[PDB]
Amino acid sequence: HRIEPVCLLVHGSPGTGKSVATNLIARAIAEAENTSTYSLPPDPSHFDGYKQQGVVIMDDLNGADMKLFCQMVSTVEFIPPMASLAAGILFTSNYVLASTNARRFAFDMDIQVMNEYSRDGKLNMAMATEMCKNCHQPANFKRCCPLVCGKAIQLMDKSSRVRYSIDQITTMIINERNRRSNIGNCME
Amino acid sequence: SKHRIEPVCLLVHGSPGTGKSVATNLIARAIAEAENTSTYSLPPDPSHFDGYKQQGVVIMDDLNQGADMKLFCQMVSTVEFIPPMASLAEAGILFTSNYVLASTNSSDALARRFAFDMDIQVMNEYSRDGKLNMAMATEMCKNCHQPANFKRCCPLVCGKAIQLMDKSSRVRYSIDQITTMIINERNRRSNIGNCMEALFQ
Amino acid sequence: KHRIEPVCLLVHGSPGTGKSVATNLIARAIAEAENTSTYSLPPDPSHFDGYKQQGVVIMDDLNQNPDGADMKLFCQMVSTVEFIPPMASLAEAGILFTSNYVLASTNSSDALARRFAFDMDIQVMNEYSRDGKLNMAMATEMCKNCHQPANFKRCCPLVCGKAIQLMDKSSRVRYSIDQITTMIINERNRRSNIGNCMEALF
Amino acid sequence: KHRIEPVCLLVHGSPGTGKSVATNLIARAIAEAENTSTYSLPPDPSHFDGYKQQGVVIMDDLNQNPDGADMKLFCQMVSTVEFIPPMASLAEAGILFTSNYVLASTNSSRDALARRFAFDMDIQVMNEYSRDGKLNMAMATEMCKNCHQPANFKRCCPLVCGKAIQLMDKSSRVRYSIDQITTMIINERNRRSNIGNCMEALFQ
Ligand SMILES: [Zn+2]
Ligand SMILES: [Zn+2]
Ligand SMILES: [Zn+2]
Ligand SMILES: [Zn+2]
């Protein structure tokens, strides 16, 4: 009976800051869904630490990966395997976020280090994590910085072709999780 | 990375007619109005927090001092807690409750968790047949002085009908009293917490 | 060879006078200066579960009946002689008590009285007392115009002596948390300068 | 969980091939770069005497003794939890471990411990500087004559610029000189610390 988790992945070259992207997005929707974030390690088979957190992030997806993923983004009741048998909890996460190098991905997006923050083609993290000094307040973040507002990095949808900021991308994922929850409500 | 202040914990012991539920619930609607929240009550022998929307107070009843108590240790803590839900459309909410009140009638590392270990005691004028004369105890109070955590007073508020007695010290408190005692140990840990955060961070 | 005797502080106070926060500020400050952490014993300390040789130890509500246990423990902690605390866990049995500071508060022969390098009464300043209770809310407000504290990054009335002070039960002189906290560190350092030199000489 | 995981380097090599020389070179340059000192643990170490929260710690011959002593300490250090190391001198006990770099050499083949090596590398002596299979130290310490300035050392020698020894990342198989991998390690630590400060601020 469970609903299908909204899903995002982020293709990137290694120095472009896609780990900090997903994590910023995860922590934000988490803050809003009064939940927490579960990280899967790369190449992971067990869910030591899962406790039905509202959002999980999958560092460096992809192949058991493309399998254990498709159990996660499904309507089937699914039971993750454990390390300590201390087993049994359903997987209920309403969001899955992940990174790498087809309809289960409501948000298929490539990244772009903006040029004033490129450093040899790589994201200049020291500069990209300085706080923004002339910005409107973000929609899902307390405060603004260049990773949130689109200065340092942006997400390009392949299909849409459009470019959004992180702040925009989180507003978008929320809404789709709500739609899905809103219909999943009325029916029931 | 521990991030939440452990909640202040009250446990009232007592024989089953003694008002022991009525006390845990009088205190809780008092605190809740003070911090402008709501209450959320757990069933006896409970496993699921369905309907827990991070309201400020949690009531446990019939705590068996133990499934009752394994789950109790996890609420009263600093470490993040994720209540199990039966509904899938809810599972995922973080436990951020400040108070847990529990009642009972009935190993030192768990004891410290009981910030207030009281014994409910029914005063004789309000005890017909050996149990709370609830019709008496609820009648409003005529010349009582204004309570601290209630806008009006009655013989449960003011210790006329019902009083609870610290198991360890042995002194007696009314309901209206032990509320601020609890409100304040919660205000206490808040202000000390912020204070230290600001001096060493 | 042997361990130096932990410099020890005892704060006497009535219940709402803030002697726990007093001892906690002092500990955190000493521990920050010593590059350490703090370890709190629960009242009625039975076990030292979680103790990993944090240089600073806190005993909240010490009962000072010399027949009591609080004081029998206390006399092993505050001594020069190997003391291997009891752990409830046997997966934790064997670590030595090496802490250099012990900070305790209570409500109130000479061999227990030597152990207290500093024996002190806490005093609410009246401007912060709700019927002789520490008005914690306004005492934990940050100060706005204090000089930089000796041992705290920022100042507040709990630190500089606006809200609370500590009176020496002997000399009858009063001290802020900040002042007592450098006397306590100076004392441990004097013990250590002496102990370390005794070692080099032999 | 208040401290940041130290950045961690593991250099595998046979026993004459200069891996000790190479971790000490990296350590010393990282240390200058942060105005700290280095602290060296002995092989199969028990005690941390002399540890004063120097920023770079060094371990050699890790897991040489396969008993476990090496790997418990290692894992306590490459962690996010408070670690109060063991000392032989009682005077010295209780200091907190807070180094940001752990540099280890080994001769072994060692999920959640691999997670701790941010750089897992094999040392390879280039043939011109090999002598009977081991690193020719006397040749390698002669200063380079015509080399661009190195990023992390004041002058260049073949140990630095990749002439004498190289470091091959076991995963990717890419090779790096010492100077390069120093900038990489420094840059990982700064990144960790920049992301950290940002997350605190945004969820502050
Ligand atoms: Zn901005
Ligand atoms: Zn009344
Ligand atoms: Zn001040
Ligand atoms: Zn060179």
Residue numbers in the entry:
A (entry chain C): 118 to 179, 184 to 207, 209 to 223, 239 to 325
B (entry chain E): 116 to 180, 184 to 224, 235 to 329
C (entry chain D): 117 to 224, 235 to 328
D (entry chain B): 117 to 226, 236 to 329
What does the paper say about this structure?
Numerous genetic and biochemical studies have shown that PV 2CATPase is implicated in series of events in virus life-cycle, from uncoating, cellular membrane rearrangement and assembly of membranous replication complexes, viral RNA synthesis to morphogenesis. PV 2CATPase has only 329 residues but is very rich in features. It can be divided into an N-terminal domain, a central ATPase domain and a C-terminal domain.
We report here the crystal structure of a soluble fragment of PV 2CATPase containing the complete ATPase and the C-terminal domains to a resolution limit of 2.55Å. It belonged to the space group of P21 and contained 6 copies of 2C per asymmetric unit (ASU). The ATPase domain contains a five-stranded parallel β-sheet (β1-β5) surrounded by three α-helices (α1-α3). Walker A motif is located on the loop connecting β1 and α1, forming the phosphate binding loop (P-loop). A phosphate group was found occupying the P-loop. The cysteine-rich motif folds into a CCCC type zinc finger. There is an unusually long loop region between the second and third zinc ligands C272 and C281, on which N277 and F278 dock their side chains into a hydrophobic groove formed between α1 and α6 helices. We found that the C-terminal helix mediates self-oligomerization of PV 2CATPase via a specific interaction between 2C-2C, which is essential to ATPase activity. We compared the PV 2C-2C conformation with multiple EV71 2C-2C conformations, which demonstrated that PV 2C-2C conformation resembles EV71 2C-2C conformation-2, a catalytically nonproductive conformation.
